């Protein structure tokens, strides 16, 4: 049971290293707030 | 390096003016940022 827990934690290291997709739920929140700010700043360029 | 009310060729603005490393080409007087606002300028008397 210890060896299975130790092995499974070893796969968590490998997964979080191997793919950029892993933290997508956090990166999506950084990206939407960055997009919303970048859009807000671009509206200063608009003539109205 | 002091905050000033600048007016270069009628581009009236405000801010601190600093020496740029930006390599403008001969034909360009003003530089803009991502935000579509003038963030660099060629001085019209001494071309830095």
């Amino acid at each position: 049971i210890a060896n299975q827990f130790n092995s499974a934690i070893g796969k968590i290291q490998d997964s979080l290293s191997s793919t950029a997709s892993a933290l997508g739920k956090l990166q999506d929140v950084v990206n939407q707030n960055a997009q919303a700010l970048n859009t807000l700043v671009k509206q200063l360029s608009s003539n109205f | 390096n002091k905050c000033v009310n600048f007016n270069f060729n009628g581009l009236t603005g405000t801010g601190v003016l600093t020496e740029s490393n930006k390599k403008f080409l001969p034909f360009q007087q003003f530089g803009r940022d991502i935000d579509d606002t003038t963030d660099a300028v060629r001085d019209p008397q001494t071309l830095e």
Binding site: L26, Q27, V30, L37, L40, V41 | D35
Partner: peptide, 23 residues
């Protein structure tokens, strides 16, 4: 996971990343 003329400013969170690591 990855001043400007617009008048924006991002404030820091009350707890640093060290304080969240300690909790």
């Amino acid at each position: 996971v990855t001043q400007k003329f617009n008048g924006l400013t991002v404030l820091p969170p009350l707890l640093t990343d060290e304080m969240i690591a300690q909790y």
